[PDB]
Design a protein around this nucleic acid. Structure first.
Lengths: 324, 192, 1062
DNA sequence: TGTTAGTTGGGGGGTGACTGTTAAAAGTGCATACCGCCAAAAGATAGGCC
DNA sequence: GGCCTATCTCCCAGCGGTATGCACTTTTAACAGTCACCCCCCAACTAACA
């Protein structure tokens, strides 16, 4: 898919991800090393590499080129995608479970309120980025799967088209979406470095791409890739927004953006059997506002102000029957 | 200040520019003639005018249309969104008001009978002129005080007059209802 | 006050002067239309001569003579709606509204182009029914001004108009010589015109005045068919013993009255099959909460209904289409009762908008048809025809000569019951959407159910919530949880059925025509077809009526059968169902059970709802005889119209139904029942009949303890493959054994005769394949032969010949092959199947075993599907050739825009409803916009994947239907009651041998005809021999004439085979 | 039981209808494309449509 | 070649919101002299609606 063949970006990215290298816990988890020049670059800078290479080929090369040094590759056949399989998982050589990757390294578990335990770097897939963000978001809000332990840092690369919709504000009317609310609410995001398409080498399953026409055709688009750093906010999970009731909030965001050119009054009438004016002047806003004119924080404000009215038992009008 | 009053003036039509030019001349020549006849004669003279001179006069209308387009573009650029919302609200209120007077004149022209006046209203109508006070409000208060001071024996004639007025209103309402049923005005029929 | 009165009086006088000036002002002016409402009658015509007569021949009886003088001279959605508007304004007496819309659409230019000739002719007939000359003249002025030439029905309306309002004028039917000049004959006026009989009577009154020597053509008796297969049943000089029902005239007459009242009420209520709920204070609170149950919403629905009709009327006057006559067809009471009954039985999970609209529109149409038939006086005609018809097929009555019910129904005077075609799909969609919106907005309830003093707010009863799956969403009407709590809180009588869903009580209406049959007044189509598609009915009516005759008679034979409920069987089912149900043996447990738990609850509730409906219908129909109508599908197979209690159901259903009329057993009686019970055990399949009978005699103690004490016994009947039918058959044989003379016992129990793998049987008959004719039992042999075990034993040869080398085959396949893993693919080879799906099937079969290495599932599935397809190719040779030829023909006909078409040997033609997804159509509205797909569009291209996959299974099912129909018609003559599930034939226990004899005989007679050759000739005459293109004539003519050559098999030997259909 | 309302006679004043002839901005109805990816393993098997 | 899918019928079920363009009729106003009409103040009753 996407691999690097330039030493300049290798050294620059090694200095960027270096930061403070004093990490007595587990240090690096590269999503897909490939050729592995980034691995030797990180070993050169004083950082360990744990190659989670998805492809079954090039597995022994990293360990044969890395076991002799004090910094150890410890190559494990897995991927940073395709983990914790549900309704399955009896046999899995490409994919592999969650606890197996951590009993082989000895992280065990820490609470959510602790410091940053690990650091995971790599790529998003070329297509299906939204599915990956949805799987990561469900793992984040469920406090299960990978994020069962304390926290994580999941610095990756993301495309510009999805970066524009990854975070948005009140305003930006064309691009304000549900994931824009979810990803700002869950983690704080900082941008670190900018990259072109032409620097990356296009790669296939059999080997590197040998067609100049194909790589020139893909480079003529020149999508500006973006290094993004998710860090989870310490007090995301609260008494109102619990990790067992998040799917109702996901329903609220999906329905409230279902009719985009509308008002909060109508959606709240369709959703809750409560007077929506009471909630709207309880949080401090007025009646005639439009849904493309609210903060991401205002959604959590509305959602958390709904629940504490314990006088009325029927409050949400959403069940598992709506999942279909 | 009114937002609609601050808008630039609309482009003057060539026919109406000619009519405005010839209106004082026709008013001075024919002071005793009605304005409707003068406007009809001016329009007849405009019909006698060939369309080529209309096009030559409308070239200036095109130029002033470009000037008005520039002016309204500058005005729209100078308008805040709050001023735009206020102007839209004023336009909607003016349209609703215009529809209200249109419906009121339509209901009045059809010959709907008035509501039956009470005996107090009959006394006010009869004795408003013979009331103390120069102001009409003082006359109304004096007549109301006189009605309060009246006895039932003197009020019996006004009650009988109100009864006759109610009977006349009932007859006119029945005739009006029959005429609307003849044309099928079911919305104008009273529910009770 | 005096001068005020004077000035108001003067102003009033000027107001009436202005009003009179407005009356003198023409209605074409916008001001006079806006200020005063009126409907316009005088037409406006955009021509000089027509305006000249407008002034002249309205300033003026010349208008009487103009009526005769003028006689001398792909539809879009709006067009369909306008035509339906005018046809609905015919039936209700609102002709001025139709005239208003017609003249308004004639006034404007764009709306003129929408109007067609039938739109004029409808209102022409409507004004002709009242006999007004001048308005007929006005409409004919409109017709001649628009350039449309008048038609025969248009002249019929004129002659009917001169016929009524008798003036004894000389010029009645004036200038009929002009009708001769244009070329129209007077005999075509009486026949083949859709006007009613009273119109024929009045036009007959009009026609005799000029020409006294004018008589109707003499009628003739209906012709009989001379086809080869249908000759013997419809033939003379034959001795026939026709069957007759057991119960007398009085019972039939009382049940006809009961069914008429059932259908006129259009709804039935069913007592609760579950346990009663214990009374309490909350029970009384929910029982007395009927103040808000209908009374707070029936008035709201009346208000909304009247306001909607007034709004739609003032939109009618302003030159637009409306649903005003479509909502004024039915009275307020029943159209509110529709919403009240639909609002019942609402689940917590709700339903979609489109489903509710589709339900409401059809529910309105059914009541419209039955009420219109009530008003017009056809109910009494039906009664007085049915009383004389029922003299036939009555035990206490006789006939001059015996004949079928259809021929006797035609021999009596024609009932002449004609019913109107249903509305097009857009009008149904809009009316259902409007009713759903009125329901969701009119019904609102106070949310303070628990405590009235807590709050006073009005919340909706049904919420519009979106349900998201994948990318898509859907609108869902979700009830408020308080109403759900109230509904499932205290009491559940909660049962209400329609009149169509419940089975009948009187003999069904004979299928005289594709329009009339099945239910007496309620409408039922002859072919089950998705909504909007109507090519089946056009093909069924275009054909000659004689060709369908026997087919319709077959359906009538399937409708006269009488059914009863076995109370002894469902006593135990009720005993298990009311208490904690055991999920074993099919009875559902309640979802109380005391992620995946929600799925279990959903499935259990979904099964228990159908359990409630079926068992409640069982208890209500207890100790009462019920008879079932049948209809025919898209291909030709038959199913009962009621979907709840069809005998084409599970196993608990077939445990209850039992014949009413009885036959005595006699010599060969109990042997067939014993073989049947061994067949229903399933333990001893592969033995001849003598060993099955010996086994039945061996297990008599088991049978008696399974029958005499069924509940809490030795529990033998649970181990069978079909438990409840086994228990019923063991009950019958235990009762039949304990008799003084077992030959004279009266039998009410049907006996299954079934053909194993009937599709391969028909394929082997068509291809004359000698090798396959033994695998399926089409050859005389002493032992039965199954194809499943043959395949599972033939793959072992390949297994050993491969694993002698010792690959991974010996790990699994030399250990684990059996006929339980190859049963599904040999079941489904007759239908569509491929290697992918078959691989999935055997993958599941291989992973089903607990003692099996799971690491080798994947390659073993590949190897096993390859060997199974190789074995099936080796066993059956002509079957694959026929399937390939049929697929090639369907592909070559679907490349062009031609849906595949064929004609059965019994005369029924078949089409296929496969076309690409059309331009979907959305209805703009207030609460929600909904979309649908219109199936009636012929413009959309064929789907060449759903036709090539689908022609070969449909042809075989057509042949199956033909064979069943032939053996039904030939069992009727000899006095045998025939009931068919598809490839499952039932008669009484006494007469199974005669069924088997005529079954083999009709199989040989059907397959003796060259079915493939006549199909090739029909598909060469149709769909070929055209100059349209050259590639069609190059490819189709070569491919369709090539047919698989037959083998060497003597077909007459099927007459001596003991295991075909056994 | 709680809520609107029209004249009753003056009095100040903007404003629609009566007279107008001719081009011209805008609402209505219809159709169509884009988004709406709320997720969930592949181990590879053909074969015909595009 | 690049790509998509997978088993016939009956039963049940079968997607919405939003921006832009096309064809066309309907106001409409371009502006102005003149005449009653209505908005509102001075307080009320019964007719009507809810």
């Amino acid at each position: 898919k996407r691999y690097v063949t330039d030493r300049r970006l290798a050294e620059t990215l090694a200095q960027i991800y270096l930061g403070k290298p004093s990490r007595p816990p587990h240090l690096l988890l590269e999503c897909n090393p490939g050729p592995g020049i980034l691995t030797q670059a990180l070993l050169e800078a004083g950082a360990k590499v744990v190659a989670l290479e998805s492809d079954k080929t090039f597995i022994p090369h990293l360990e044969s080129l890395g076991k002799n040094l004090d910094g150890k590759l410890r190559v494990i056949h897995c991927d940073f995608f395709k983990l914790d399989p549900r309704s399955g998982g009896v046999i899995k050589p490409p994919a592999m479970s969650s606890r197996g990757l951590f009993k082989n390294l000895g992280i065990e578990a820490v609470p959510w309120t602790a410091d940053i335990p690990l650091k995971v770097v790599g790529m998003f897939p070329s297509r299906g980025e939204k599915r990956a963000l949805w799987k990561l978001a469900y793992d984040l809000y469920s406090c299960t799967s990978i994020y069962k332990f304390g926290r994580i840092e999941v610095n990756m690369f993301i495309g510009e088209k999805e970066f524009q919709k990854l975070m948005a504000d009140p305003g930006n009317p064309d691009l304000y979406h549900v994931l824009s609310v979810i990803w700002q609410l869950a983690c704080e995001i900082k941008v670190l470095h900018m990259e072109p398409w032409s620097s990356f080498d296009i790669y296939t399953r059999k080997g590197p791409l040998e067609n100049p026409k194909r790589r020139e055709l893909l480079d003529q688009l020149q999508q500006k890739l973006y290094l993004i750093q998710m860090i989870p906010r310490q007090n995301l999970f609260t008494k109102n927004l619990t990790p067992m009731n998040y799917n109702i909030f996901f329903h609220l965001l999906k329905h409230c953006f279902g009719r985009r050119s509308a008002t909060v009054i109508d959606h709240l009438r369709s959703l809750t059997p409560l007077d929506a004016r009471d909630i709207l002047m309880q949080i401090g806003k007025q009646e005639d506002e439009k849904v493309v004119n609210m903060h991401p924080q205002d959604f959590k404000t509305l959602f958390e102000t709904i629940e504490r009215s314990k006088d009325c038992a029927y409050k949400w009008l959403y069940d598992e029957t709506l999942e279909d | 200040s009114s937002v609609l009053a601050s808008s630039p003036k609309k482009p003057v039509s060539s026919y109406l520019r000619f009519s405005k030019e010839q209106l004082p001349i026709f008013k001075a020549q024919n002071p005793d003639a009605k304005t409707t006849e003068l406007i009809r004669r001016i329009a007849q003279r405009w019909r006698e005018l060939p369309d080529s001179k209309k096009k030559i006069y409308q070239d200036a209308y095109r130029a002033e249309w470009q000037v008005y387009k520039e002016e309204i573009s500058r005005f729209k650029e100078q308008l805040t969104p709050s001023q735009i919302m206020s102007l839209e609200k004023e336009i909607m209120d003016k349209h609703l008001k215009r529809k209200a007077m249109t419906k009121k004149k339509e209901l009045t022209l059809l010959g709907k009978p008035k509501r039956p006046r009470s005996a107090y209203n009959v006394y006010v109508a009869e004795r408003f002129q013979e009331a103390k006070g120069d102001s009409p409000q003082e006359k109304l208060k004096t007549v109301k005080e006189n009605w309060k001071n009246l006895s039932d024996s003197e009020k019996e004639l006004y009650i009988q007059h109100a009864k006759e007025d109610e009977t006349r209103y009932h007859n006119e309402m029945k005739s009006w209802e029959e005429q609307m049923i003849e044309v099928g005005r079911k919305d104008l029929l009273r529910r009770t | 006050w005096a001068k005020i009165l004077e000035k108001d009086k003067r102003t009033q006088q000027m107001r009436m002067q202005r009003l009179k000036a407005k009356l003198q002002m023409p209605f074409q002016s916008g001001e006079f239309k806006a200020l005063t409402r009126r409907l316009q009658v005088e037409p406006r015509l955009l021509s000089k001569q027509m305006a000249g007569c407008l002034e002249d021949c309205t300033r003026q009886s010349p208008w009487e003579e103009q009526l005769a003088r003028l006689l001398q001279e792909q539809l879009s959605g709006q067009q369909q709606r306008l035509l339906a508007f005018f046809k609905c304004c015919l039936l209700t007496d609102q002709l001025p509204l139709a005239h208003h819309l017609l003249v308004v659409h004639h006034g404007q230019r764009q709306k003129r182009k929408l109007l067609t000739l039938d739109m004029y002719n409808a209102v022409m007939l409507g004004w002709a029914r009242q006999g007004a000359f001048k308005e007929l003249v006005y409409v004919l002025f409109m017709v001649k001004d628009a350039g449309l030439t008048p038609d025969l029905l248009s002249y019929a309306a004129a002659l009917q108009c001169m016929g009524r309002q008798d003036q004894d004028a000389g010029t009645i039917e004036r200038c009929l010589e002009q009708m001769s000049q244009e070329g129209l004959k007077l005999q075509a006026l009486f026949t083949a015109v859709l006007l009613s009989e009273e119109d024929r009577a009045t036009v007959l009154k009009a026609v005799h005045k000029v020409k006294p020597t004018f008589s109707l053509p003499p009628q003739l008796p209906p012709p009989v068919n001379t086809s080869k297969l249908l000759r013997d049943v419809y033939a003379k000089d034959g001795r026939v013993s026709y069957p007759k029902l057991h119960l007398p005239l009085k019972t039939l007459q009382c049940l006809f009255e009961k069914q008429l009242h059932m259908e006129l009420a259009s709804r039935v209520c069913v007592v609760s099959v579950e346990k009663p709920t214990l009374p309490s204070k909350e029970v009384k609170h929910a029982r007395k909460t009927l103040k808000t149950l209908r009374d707070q919403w029936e008035k709201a629905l009346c208000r909304a209904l009247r306001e909607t009709k007034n709004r739609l009327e003032r939109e009618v006057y302003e030159g637009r289409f409306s649903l005003y006559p479509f909502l004024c067809l039915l009275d307020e009471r029943e159209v509110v009762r529709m919403l009240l009954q639909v609002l019942q039985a609402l689940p917590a999970q709700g339903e979609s908008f489109t489903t509710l609209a589709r339900e409401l529109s059809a529910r309105t149409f059914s009541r419209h048809v039955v009420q219109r038939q009530r008003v017009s006086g056809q109910v009494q005609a039906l009664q007085n025809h049915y009383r004389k018809y029922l003299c036939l097929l009555a035990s206490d009555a006789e006939v001059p000569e015996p004949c079928l019910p259809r021929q006797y129904w035609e021999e009596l005077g024609a009932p002449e019951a004609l019913r109107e075609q249903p509305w097009p799909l857009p009008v149904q969609m809009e009316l259902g959407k409007l009713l759903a919106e009125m329901l969701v907005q009119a019904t609102q309830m106070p949310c303070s159910l628990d405590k009235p003093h807590r709050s006073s707010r009005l919340v909706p009863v049904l919420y519009h919530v979106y349900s998201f799956r994948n990318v898509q969403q859907i609108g869902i009407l979700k009830p408020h949880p308080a109403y759900v709590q109230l509904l499932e809180k205290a009491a559940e009588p909660t049962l209400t059925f329609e009149a169509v869903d419940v089975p009948m009580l009187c003999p069904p209406l004979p299928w005289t025509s594709p329009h009339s049959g099945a239910f007496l007044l309620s409408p039922t189509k002859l072919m089950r077809t998705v909504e909007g598609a109507t090519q089946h009915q056009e093909l069924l009516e275009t054909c000659p009526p004689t060709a369908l005759h026997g087919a319709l008679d077959a359906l009538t034979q399937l409708g006269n059968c009488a059914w009863r409920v076995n109370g002894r069987v469902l006593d135990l089912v009720l005993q298990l169902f009311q208490a904690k149900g055991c999920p074993q043996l099919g009875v559902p447990a309640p979802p109380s059970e005391a992620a995946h738990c929600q799925k279990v609850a959903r499935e259990m509730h979904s099964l228990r709802a159908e359990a409630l409906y079926r068992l409640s219908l069982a208890q209500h129909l207890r100790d009462r005889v019920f008879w079932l109508p049948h209809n025919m599908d898209f291909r030709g197979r038959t199913y009962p119209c009621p979907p709840h209690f069809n005998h084409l159901g599970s196993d608990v259903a077939r445990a209850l139904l039992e014949f009413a009329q009885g036959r005595p057993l006699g010599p060969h009686g109990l042997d067939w029942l014993k073989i049947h019970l061994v067949n229903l055990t399933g333990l001893k399949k592969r033995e001849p009949l003598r060993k099955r009978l010996a086994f039945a005699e061996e297990v008599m103690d088991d049978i008696l303890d399974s029958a005499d004490q069924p509940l809490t016994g030795r529990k033998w009947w649970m181990g069978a493959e079909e438990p409840w039918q086994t228990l019923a058959c063991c009950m019958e044989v235990a009762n039949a054994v304990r008799a003084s003379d077992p030959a004279a016992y009266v039998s009410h129990l049907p006996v299954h005769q079934d053909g194993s793998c009937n599709g391969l049987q028909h394929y082997a008959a068509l291809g004359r394949d000698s090798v396959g004719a033994a695998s399926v039992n089409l050859e005389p042999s002493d032992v039965p032969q199954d194809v499943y075990s043959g395949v599972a034993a033939q793959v072992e040869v390949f297994r050993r010949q491969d694993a002698q080398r010792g690959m991974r085959v010996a790990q699994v396949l030399e250990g684990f092959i059996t006929r339980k893993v190859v049963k599904q693919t040999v079941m489904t080879v007759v239908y569509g199947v491929t290697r992918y799906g078959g691989r999935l099937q055997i993958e599941k079969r291989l992973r089903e075993l607990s003692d099996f290495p799971q690491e080798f599932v994947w390659e073993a599935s590949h190897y096993l599907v390859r060997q199974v397809f190789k074995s099936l190719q080796e066993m059956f040779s002509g079957t694959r050739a026929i399937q390939h030829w049929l697929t090639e023909s369907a592909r070559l006909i679907s490349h062009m825009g031609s849906v595949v078409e064929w004609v059965t040997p019994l005369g029924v033609p078949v089409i296929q409803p496969y076309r690409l997804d059309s331009k979907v159509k959305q209805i703009g509205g207030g609460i929600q916009s909904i979309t649908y797909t219109h199936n009636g569009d012929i413009s959309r291209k064929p789907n060449t994947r759903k036709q090539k996959n689908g022609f070969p299974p449909n042809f075989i099912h057509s042949l199956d239907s033909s064979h069943m129909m032939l053996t039904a018609l030939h069992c009727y003559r000899k006095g045998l009651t025939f009931v068919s599930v598809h490839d499952c034939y039932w008669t009484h226990a006494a007469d199974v041998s005669v069924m088997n004899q005529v079954c083999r005989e009709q199989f040989v007679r059907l397959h003796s005809e060259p079915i493939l050759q006549d199909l090739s000739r029909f598909l060469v005459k149709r769909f070929c021999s055209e100059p349209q293109k050259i590639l069609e004539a190059s490819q189709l003519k070569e491919t369709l004439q090539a047919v698989p050559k037959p083998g060497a098999f003597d077909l007459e030997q099927v007459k001596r085979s003991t295991y075909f259909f056994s």
